[PDB]
């Protein structure tokens, strides 16, 4: 009601009019007026303790290993030649599930570029792994360098 | 997220009017006048659901008193004699018999007078 345009003056007199008492043209009761409790631009960042996130990710990964959906691949596609079809054939031979998660080192670009277009497959760098993407996909695949770096960072 | 109010009010108001079908005037056409006397109607239903047992028992006893006086005995004497004889038949069945078998009442009044004591004013 305090931000709408105009109508800062009394619509009419108190007594003698016969109609109900009002105070502003832009009252929430009126049509075209303001809203009773208006929302404002805002944020919902929730801080979660590091043990909380690490423990949750560790539980998710432990369940994944228990269900036997973790694998090792030395390289996804041949170097200096991005080929989405080769990656598709490789993943089809390797597994038959609809969605597969692959962890690839940052410096490897050809594999990510080749696998980007396909929709049910997603690629994440080992430093960018998160619980939501772990839970979303059906199969999870580790590259050798990525798994080694992740294990070393965990143990350090 | 703004939730503008299309079906939520409509479902409940329609169920109110649908339950209120069969009245006169604004009663069966208008909501604000339906819910009020809808609740009044159902409150009347609640009250007279208890009142119905009383009214039926009243009619039942009235018919039994009629039959007893036709057979030349009073209601109180008939009931007292029946209790003395130890017959556990209830006013529903007595009333249906009075509608049905005066032979049944003839036997019943005979039993009642047989079970009736010698003197009704004895100190016992």
């Amino acid at each position: 009601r305090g931000e709408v345009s105009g109508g800062g003056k009394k619509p009419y007199r108190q007594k003698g009019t016969g109609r109900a008492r009002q105070g502003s043209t832009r009252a929430p009761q009126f049509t075209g007026g303001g809203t009773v409790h208006g929302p404002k631009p805002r944020d919902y960042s929730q801080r979660t303790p590091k043990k909380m996130i690490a423990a949750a990710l560790r539980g998710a990964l432990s369940d994944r290993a228990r269900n036997d959906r973790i694998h090792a691949v030395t390289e996804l596609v041949e170097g200096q030649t991005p080929s989405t079809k080769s990656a598709k054939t490789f993943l089809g031979t390797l597994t038959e599930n609809k969605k597969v998660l692959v962890v690839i080192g940052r410096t490897d670009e050809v594999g990510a570029k080749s696998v980007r277009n396909l929709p049910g497959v997603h690629v994440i760098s080992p430093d960018q792994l998160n619980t939501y993407d772990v839970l979303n996909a059906d199969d999870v695949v580790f590259s050798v360098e990525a798994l080694n770096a992740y294990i070393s960072a965990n143990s350090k | 997220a703004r939730v503008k109010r299309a079906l939520n009010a409509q479902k409940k108001r329609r169920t109110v009017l649908k339950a209120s079908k069969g009245y006169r005037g604004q009663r069966s056409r208008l909501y604000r006048k339906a819910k009020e006397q809808q609740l009044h109607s159902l409150t009347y239903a609640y009250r007279d659901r208890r009142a119905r047992k009383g009214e039926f028992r009243k009619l039942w006893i009235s018919r039994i008193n009629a039959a007893a006086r036709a057979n030349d005995i009073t209601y109180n004497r008939l009931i007292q004699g029946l209790k003395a004889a130890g017959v556990e038949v209830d006013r529903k069945n007595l009333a249906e018999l009075a509608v049905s078998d005066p032979a049944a009442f003839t036997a019943l009044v005979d039993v009642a007078r047989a079970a009736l004591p010698e003197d009704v004013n004895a100190p016992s």
């Binding site: 998710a60 369940d63 269900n67 839970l135 979303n136 | -």
Partner: protein, 145 residues
Amino acid sequence: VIKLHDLKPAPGEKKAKTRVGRGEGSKGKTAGRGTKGTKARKNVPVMFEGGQMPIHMRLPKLKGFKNRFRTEYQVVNVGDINKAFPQGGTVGVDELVAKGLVRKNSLVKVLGDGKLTVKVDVTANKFSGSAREAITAAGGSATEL
């Protein structure tokens, strides 16, 4: 076999939010304020108790000052040192910081509430009589800077 489908909150971790004044079935016509009154309109000040002078108003103040130039230390227990040093030996500010008994920057003092049975060489700033006697009786040394 857990999917994003198989995620549930802890039993009782979720309590329903109360919608007040959302129908006479649960909370109606008053919104938990009851009948008429200033509490039914806005509020009452916390420090206001009907006009009479509040308990923060008809009471004297505490005398004396706060001594803004106060020097602060932290006590370290002789029993705690004995428990954390079964082998014993020389102990210093860095050693206590590593052991996590006091803040790293904060200045340390000790007292002799506990008992000492292991030879411990103590380096500190302020020594009390009880801690001094405990150190001397335990066949050790404790020097103060």
